[PDB]
Amino acid sequence: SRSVWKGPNIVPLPIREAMTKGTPIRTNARAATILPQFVGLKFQIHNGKEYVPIEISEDMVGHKLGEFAPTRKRF
């Protein structure tokens, strides 16, 4: 969770298929922490309408998935 002593908030994710077949992981779980082992994987994050595709880098670790799928248009 948020408090660092509580650790990251982990949720179920079909990661093993994406660790072997290189397929993207399509998820609505915007509240899941990006663990260090998520690096290099392709995610498709729901933003309420569509699925933004992103590739996880080391700078994204610690942050959460929904931070890179904007829910609203800027203007």
Partner RNA sequence: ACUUAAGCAGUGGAGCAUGUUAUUUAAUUCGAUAAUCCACGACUAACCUUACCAUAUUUUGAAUAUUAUAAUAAUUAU
Partner RNA sequence: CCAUAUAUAUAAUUUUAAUUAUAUAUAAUUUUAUAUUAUUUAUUAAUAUAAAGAAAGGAAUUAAGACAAAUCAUAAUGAUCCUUAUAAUAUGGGUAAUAGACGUGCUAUAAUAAAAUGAUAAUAAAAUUAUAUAAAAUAUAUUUAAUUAUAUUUAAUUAAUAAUAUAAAACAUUUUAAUUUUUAAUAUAUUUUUUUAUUAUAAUAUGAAUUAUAAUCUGAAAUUCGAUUAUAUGAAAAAA
* Chain positions contacting RNA, by CB under 7 A: 1-6, 9, 28-31, 46-49, 63-67, 70-75
Q: Where does this chain touch other proteins (CB under 8 A) — which range of 6-14, 15-23, 50-58, 60-68?
A: 6-14
From the list other proteins, RNA, none, partner contacted by residue 41 (C-beta under 5 to 8 A by kind): none
Site size for other proteins (CB under 8 A): 8
**What does 13-67 look like in DSSP terms, one character per residue?**
---HHHHHS---EEE--TT-B--GGGTT-EEEEE-SSSEEEEE--GGGTTSBGGG
- Residue 64's identity, in one-letter code, is K
